[PDB]
């Protein structure tokens, strides 16, 4: 009567990501491919804008473009909601508020299709300033480490997730992106509702020297922590 979804992540799992985007009426599509290894919290992915030039900076899409690949230590396994929803998956909803600028709303389904973990997203961005840091492409091509705060939402049989992303501006300052996130299971099976805890994230962005399309190569490591009982 308990989920066994964690067993789907004991080894390397192939990933596909598909994003349909519209920001201030600027439409785009992004595809990602790679693999994930939850035993080390490790993601290896390459993303391509298949429709032309990406109308927003790649860093602003990183959070939108699979937290089931977080490493949950053995003493925290009962707090891993993301894997417990698998293989049927979960819906991931966000609003991302860019300080003094527009917001992204995103709705994704994350689930297994065959042997592959697939993240399928729709993104809508509104109220951006064409001369701001996003539509004006003023953000550095890099990424910082963050803390992601996870809380149970028992009434929705899911979780609430809150965190702040800081995008370095190419001049000096930082662009804040305030993330409000909700995850709910797609299936009717049992899920794990966690005690409060956090994920520690680290992301490296690079380019493929042979790729002529607009693209992003991403290497990411994420480990859950903050529950000390049983260490």
């Amino acid at each position: 009567m308990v989920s066994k979804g964690e067993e789907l992540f004991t080894g390397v799992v192939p990933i596909l990501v598909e994003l349909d985007g519209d920001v201030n009426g600027h439409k785009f599509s992004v595809s990602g491919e790679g693999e994930g290894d939850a035993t080390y919290g490790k993601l290896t992915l390459k993303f391509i804008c298949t429709t032309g030039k990406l109308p927003v900076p790649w860093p602003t899409l990183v959070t939108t473009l699979v937290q089931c690949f977080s490493r949950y230590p053995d003493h925290m396994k009962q707090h891993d909601f993301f894997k417990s929803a698998m293989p049927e998956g979960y819906v991931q909803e966000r609003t991302i508020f860019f300080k003094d600028d527009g917001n992204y709303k995103t709705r994704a389904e994350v689930k297994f299709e065959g042997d592959t973990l697939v993240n399928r997203i729709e993104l809508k961005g509104i109220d951006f300033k064409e001369d701001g840091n996003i539509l004006g492409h003023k953000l550095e091509y890099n990424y910082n480490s963050h803390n992601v705060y996870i809380m149970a939402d028992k009434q929705k049989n899911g979780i609430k997730v809150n965190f702040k992303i800081r995008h370095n501006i190419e001049d000096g300052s930082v662009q804040l992106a305030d993330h409000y996130q909700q995850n709910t299971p797609i299936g009717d099976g049992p899920v794990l509702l966690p005690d409060n805890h956090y994920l520690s994230t680290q992301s490296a962005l690079s380019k493929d020297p042979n790729e002529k399309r607009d693209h992003m190569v991403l290497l990411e490591f994420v480990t859950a922590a903050g529950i000390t009982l049983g260490m």
Binding site: R166, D195, G226
Partner: protein, 154 residues
């Protein structure tokens, strides 16, 4: 400062005696990681004996991380009453906000930690402080239907 990175890891790992060794051999008690966490932030998640050792060795009780959170914020978020108490004993700012968007009282109220609420109030928590959504701790207890807490808060 390589001892400081070792101390951050020892605190994260809950290794009480390794923290003791590292500090006796000179480790910086306020070593900082990439998210602005000190060893005291890491230990606020439930490592009471490390919290105590760090505070006795000069840890900055009110250090704010890159999001504005102090160790007292993290201890309230994770529900650790004894850590809340020792932090306040060592001068933690009971009403710290300064970009966090919440005081510790808000966090304790959100998650229904009545004992922590009462300790914070006893140490001067401001019941009229509003979080970034405009809500007091009382409002939070109303929105959560927590009448035990609404009671305590009036």
């Amino acid at each position: 400062s390589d001892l400081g990175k070792k101390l951050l890891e020892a605190a994260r790992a809950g290794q009480d005696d390794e923290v003791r060794i590292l500090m006796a051999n000179g480790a910086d008690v306020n070593a900082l990681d990439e998210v602005g966490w000190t060893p005291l932030h890491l230990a606020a998640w439930g490592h009471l004996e490390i919290v105590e050792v760090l505070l006795k060795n000069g840890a900055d009780v009110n250090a704010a991380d890159i999001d504005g959170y102090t160790p007292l914020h993290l201890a309230a978020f994770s529900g650790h009453l004894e850590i809340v108490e020792v932090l306040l004993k060592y001068g933690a700012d009971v009403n710290a906000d300064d970009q966090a968007g919440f005081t510790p009282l808000h966090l304790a109220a959100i998650f229904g930690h009545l004992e922590i609420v009462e300790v914070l109030l006893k140490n001067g928590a401001d019941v009229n402080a509003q979080d970034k959504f405009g809500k007091t701790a009382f409002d939070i207890s109303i929105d959560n239907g927590n009448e035990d807490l609404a009671e305590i808060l009036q």
